[PDB]
Amino acid sequence: LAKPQNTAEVQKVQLTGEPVPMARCVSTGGRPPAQITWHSDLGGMPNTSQVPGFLSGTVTVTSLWILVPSSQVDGKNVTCKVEHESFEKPQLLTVNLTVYYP
Amino acid sequence: AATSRDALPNTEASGPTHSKEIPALTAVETGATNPLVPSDTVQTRHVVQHRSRSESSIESFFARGACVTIMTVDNPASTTNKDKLFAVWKITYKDTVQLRRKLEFFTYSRFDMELTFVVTANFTETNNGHALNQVYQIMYVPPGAPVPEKWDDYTWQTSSNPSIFYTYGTAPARISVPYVGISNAYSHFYDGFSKVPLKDQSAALGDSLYGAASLNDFGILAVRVVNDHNPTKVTSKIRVYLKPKHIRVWCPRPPRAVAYYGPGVDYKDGTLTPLSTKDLTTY
Amino acid sequence: DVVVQAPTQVPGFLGDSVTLPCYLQVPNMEVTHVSQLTWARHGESGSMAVFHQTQGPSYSESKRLEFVAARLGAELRNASLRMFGLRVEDEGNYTCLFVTFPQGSRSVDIWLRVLA
Amino acid sequence: GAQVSSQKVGAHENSNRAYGGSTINYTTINYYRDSASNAASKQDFSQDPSKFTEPIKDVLIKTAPMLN
Amino acid sequence: ACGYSDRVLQLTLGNSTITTQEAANSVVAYGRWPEYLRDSEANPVDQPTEPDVAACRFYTLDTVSWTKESRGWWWKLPDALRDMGLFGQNMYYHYLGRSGYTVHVQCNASKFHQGALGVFAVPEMCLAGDSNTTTMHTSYQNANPGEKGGTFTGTFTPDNNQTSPARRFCPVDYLLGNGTLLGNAFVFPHQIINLRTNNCATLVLPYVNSLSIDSMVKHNNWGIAILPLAPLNFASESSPEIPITLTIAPMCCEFNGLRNITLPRLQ
Amino acid sequence: GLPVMNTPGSNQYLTADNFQSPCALPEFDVTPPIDIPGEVKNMMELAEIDTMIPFDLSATKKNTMEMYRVRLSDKPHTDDPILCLSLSPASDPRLSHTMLGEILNYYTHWAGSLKFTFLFCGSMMATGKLLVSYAPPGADPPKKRKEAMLGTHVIWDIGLQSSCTMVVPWISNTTYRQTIDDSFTEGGYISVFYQTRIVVPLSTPREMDILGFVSACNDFSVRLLRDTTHIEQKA
Amino acid sequence: YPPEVSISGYDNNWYLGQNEATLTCDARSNPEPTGYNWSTTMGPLPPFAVAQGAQLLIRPVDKPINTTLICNVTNALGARQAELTVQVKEGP
């Protein structure tokens, strides 16, 4: 197996009507692929996907956390959980949501 | 007149060369292998060769008994709910893999067959009861003859089938059989079917297995413990060893390189990677 | 009885190197002579690394595998094998066997889980 | 009806008034009417490999160009 | 002296002639030229039919196309010629038949192309099936494609439809479609069409079988397997293609047991 | 009766024995042979046939058609190896599954000369010279042309005769070698190098494959029949 | 986001002659609001209600008044507002 390492950013969102990606998580170079789950007080809809990784046999998973944006979520906390059988423990990555509004 | 135990050719001394003779250059597109010996491309000394190919003659490559099956039989108490077990084995060299792979270096063969039988027995219930020495009947039931349905029915009369009555604890039993094929040679591979499906007939009626034919149906061996039921159950195994003797073979083939998977040439997913990793420029 | 002693799974780091531990428990009551020890990949028509009591080591590709403990002349017990630069294609089930006497040959399977 | 044949002797004992030298023969007598019962004689023949190594219609002369 | 050459051949059988200017000699399988059945090896006693030039002549099968993705092709004999002129008619009107063949595989390209085809003639070319739940189940119809032949694949794909099984071969290329390694197929009679060297392969095949004569409709004596040992390439093009054409002539064919014509179920 | 005395071996069963035994089908009417083409008299006849070497057993090429292709290119001259192989015909993974290797795995001992023939499969417009080498054992295995060139070798000029054969002469301390990896009976090193470089004109593939074949010479023999590790039956 | 505005400071029991009570214009926006503006539903702030930045100081009243008050908050993104009717009576 290969120990991936991982990122999360917040995708800043306007006040679109549509459910859009508000936070991204990405575990690059996993073997076996990492498991990405989201936890937060305001659960949304996670869309996960994966491209082959760098070294043969690795996989990089890019999950993004899709939600219908709304003023009261700005500055709220969303946590990406990247789980993998090579970590000491499920590794927790946390984003500071951002929504611009009038 | 060259025999299998004759010495191979001597190496002749050969010196330096500079000419239009070009043994080293060739063209494998023709389908031929270049017949070179060392004196064609290096300087050689004279050597009187004594080695021979005596042990790789077809006869010697095959001169061994190989296990082709294990048959189980028993002799239980008469009070058993379960029937006394007699064994029935369809004769073949394809239930095991080692002899099969050696014969399959060739497409066709002819041989007399020597069969040797090793018989072993044991108690199975942790009991102290005993059993008296067993006699076994090994009956050859050729295709068409009535196969036994019970360990003691009339077929074991064997008026015409050959049978061996083997006594436990004596030298392993042994018989020879002639080349018995209905063809001029045994076929190790048959690229065909036993039925032509006809347009005017249902598909079910014209169907048959690929690669199968009675070319190789040789009937069965039926084996029983002749002794009546005993209060302590004894289980036995008959191991059958086949040695092909007086053998001829034809049309060489690449040997089986992935695991066998049934009596045909089929292969199974997950077994198709015989070669291991090795880098091109690593010794 | 002589029994071979190895983890069921080993991680396993991409681009790093790992040691696969494989050791022979041999109850000090009974004696055995272990002639050689062979690491093989799963069903590779034969061996990947082999060390021998007297003849020493031999590797498929020498540049990437190394017997950690096995030492020439000594009584062979520790088949532990270190392989460098793990890539994805290095994941798999590996067998490790010892060739003893008069016990025969005892072997075990190691899952090499490679992860990043 | 004995068949007497010679052995190809490999290791020779220190002897030439009984073993190693003065051709050592062996004897075979068949006991059965069926020839399938016979032992193998191992007195076998070799052949040229050409039907597999050179199955070309026009003869190969190795010192010459194969293609001409 | 006159300029005769290994590379330049003419083959004439019946009313047909083949020429080639880039041959690599030609192979006579196991050193045995085809022949009629000798009286000392004969078995059916009826006077045989021997069509001679009516059937012993070059028949060209449908051409196929070699690309960078081709894994290989296979045909069986006599099956690939079953619908060829009077050879096919004599085959189906008789219970028994035997025949040898001249097989000529054709594939030209240019001095800037590269690639190499192994052309193997295999006695009893039994191929593996597509099933992991039943063995020896390929149907007569799928085992006998006629002149279109079949293909090899780089991947074994088990048929999982147990309701209506496909019942066809799944011949994996590096296992020669039969469970043995392709690198060893050279112990079978063969030639290689390596485009820088030659543009054809010629194999003369004797009738081979464990019997003097047999059912041609039930049994194929020879298989022809063509696999790319080195892939097709050209200049720096991503999708080159060049055709491969098979032309086969029966030789010394004879038949016994004449009756009404066999009308086989082929679909 | 004639006084007799049973010796050791009595009633066994030695699987390599060679005795008479009663026939279970007396007076059977045996079908006669016919003259089938292709009869073989000695397994070594099969060993003398060229079969193709799976040279490239990398993790992604092994067990695919690509394992047989050795890729060359028109890159500038280098003294670094195209391929490196050990002369252990029954146990090096590249040789052990060739027809020669698979027959040698039914025997314990092998002896004699071998030969490697390479086929160039580039375009007709491609040229080049390569050096094929055999270094008998006991020194540093050749990793540079400078060392390989000091052993047995053939410099191959690519051209209309498509292929080139290097003979590996039987050079050995023992009279037979083992068919397993073994230092005492080690056979040495086979390697191929660029002698000049592959050259192509424009509009021509700059990369191409060579294929290699191995076969035994007429002085080759094997002995001590044994089972192979190349097939098994689990349970 | 644009300002979200409300006005706190009013318990319905404002009476004549009370002490200066002061209302805040609470607004939470991002980024922080740039401008506060105090007006009435009638236009100009009544004399008694003097604006102080983000707050409105409500002086003692001589006679009972109604005004509905408007806090117009400008932040970097837009400008929003909140309403509040406020009464001053005599009662006790």
Ligand SMILES: *[C@@H]1O[C@H](CO[C@@H]2O[C@@H](C)[C@@H](O)[C@@H](O)[C@@H]2O)[C@@H](O[C@@H]2O[C@H](CO)[C@@H](O[C@@H]3O[C@H](CO)[C@@H](O)[C@H](O[C@H]4O[C@H](CO)[C@@H](O)[C@H](O)[C@@H]4O)[C@@H]3O)[C@H](O)[C@H]2NC(C)=O)[C@H](O)[C@H]1NC(C)=O
């Ligand atoms: C290393 O070795 C382990 C150990 O197990 C053993 O070795 C294997 C190589 C293989 O030979 C095994 O048969 C052997 O016992 C390997 O891990 C095992 O792999 C097997 C088969 O792939 C797994 O089987 C699965 O077991 C699951 C529960 O444990 C079960 O849910 C699965 O069911 C599904 O798939 C089956 C077909 O396999 C199908 O019938 C069902 O319908 C369903 O879809 C399946 O049975 C085991 O999980 C593994 N065993 C253990 C103990 O972990 C391992 O694969 C190998 N290493 C690598 C890298 O491959």
Ligand SMILES: *[C@@H]1O[C@H](CO[C@@H]2O[C@@H](C)[C@@H](O)[C@@H](O)[C@@H]2O)[C@@H](O[C@@H]2O[C@H](CO)[C@@H](O[C@@H]3O[C@H](CO)[C@@H](O)[C@H](O)[C@@H]3O)[C@H](O)[C@H]2NC(C)=O)[C@H](O)[C@H]1NC(C)=O
């Ligand atoms: C401050 O404003 C109040 C009234 O406040 C009320 O709410 C506002 C938003 C507006 O809609 C006002 O019009 C509304 O009244 C003034 O006192 C109010 O005066 C009106 C008469 O002008 C009263 O009308 C009455 O309606 C009730 C039923 O609702 C009837 O029972 C009565 O008979 C009468 O018709 C209204 O009740 C009264 N409000 C209160 C609480 O008494 C107030 O005058 C003004 N400030 C001053 C002193 O000028």
Ligand SMILES: *[C@@H]1O[C@H](CO)[C@@H](O[C@@H]2O[C@H](CO)[C@@H](O[C@@H]3O[C@H](CO)[C@@H](O)[C@H](O)[C@@H]3O)[C@H](O)[C@H]2NC(C)=O)[C@H](O)[C@H]1NC(C)=O
């Ligand atoms: C998510 O991240 C944002 C910043 O990018 C956090 O906003 C910050 O929130 C804090 C209070 O929670 C504000 O701090 C206060 O600032 C004042 C000065 O204006 C100071 O006097 C106080 O002591 C206190 O520090 C801070 O101004 C604000 N940052 C910015 C740039 O406006 C938010 O709290 C985070 N939310 C979560 C759920 O983690």
Ligand SMILES: *[C@@H]1O[C@H](CO)[C@@H](O[C@@H]2O[C@H](CO)[C@@H](O[C@@H]3O[C@H](CO)[C@@H](O)[C@H](O)[C@@H]3O)[C@H](O)[C@H]2NC(C)=O)[C@H](O)[C@H]1NC(C)=O
């Ligand atoms: C069989 O031999 C192997 C290789 O010698 C042993 O593995 C390793 O041995 C070293 C040295 O004894 C152990 O490390 C020592 O431990 C610390 C950390 O715990 C390490 O930083 C130093 O190298 C230190 O000297 C190491 O833990 C051990 N590795 C493993 C995976 O076990 C092995 O212990 C032997 N096995 C048996 C069963 O005896």
Ligand SMILES: *[C@@H]1O[C@H](CO)[C@@H](O[C@@H]2O[C@H](CO)[C@@H](O)[C@H](O)[C@H]2NC(C)=O)[C@H](O)[C@H]1NC(C)=O
């Ligand atoms: C998860 O998100 C992906 C990416 O946005 C979605 O993939 C889209 O699928 C839809 C519907 O099938 C297509 O019309 C789009 O073309 C795809 N978009 C992109 C950017 O590729 C997918 O629908 C989502 N998956 C699930 C299971 O909800």
Ligand SMILES: *[C@@H]1O[C@H](CO)[C@@H](O[C@@H]2O[C@H](CO)[C@@H](O)[C@H](O)[C@H]2NC(C)=O)[C@H](O)[C@H]1NC(C)=O
């Ligand atoms: C929101 O997430 C932030 C991190 O982005 C959390 O901040 C951590 O807070 C703990 C104490 O609660 C500190 O020990 C860490 O050092 C902080 N991390 C960083 C990067 O500064 C915060 O606790 C979360 N709050 C909520 C309400 O979810």
Ligand SMILES: CCCCCCCCCCCCCCCC(=O)O
């Ligand atoms: C009492 C013992 C009787 C033994 C009877 C032996 C019966 C004939 C067996 C023929 C074995 C054929 C082996 C080659 C099979 C093949 O064609 O593939």
Ligand SMILES: *[C@@H]1O[C@H](CO)[C@@H](O)[C@H](O)[C@H]1NC(C)=O
């Ligand atoms: C609020 O204030 C802004 C800034 O001057 C002004 O332009 C806007 O029109 C005002 N809106 C209302 C409804 O008072």
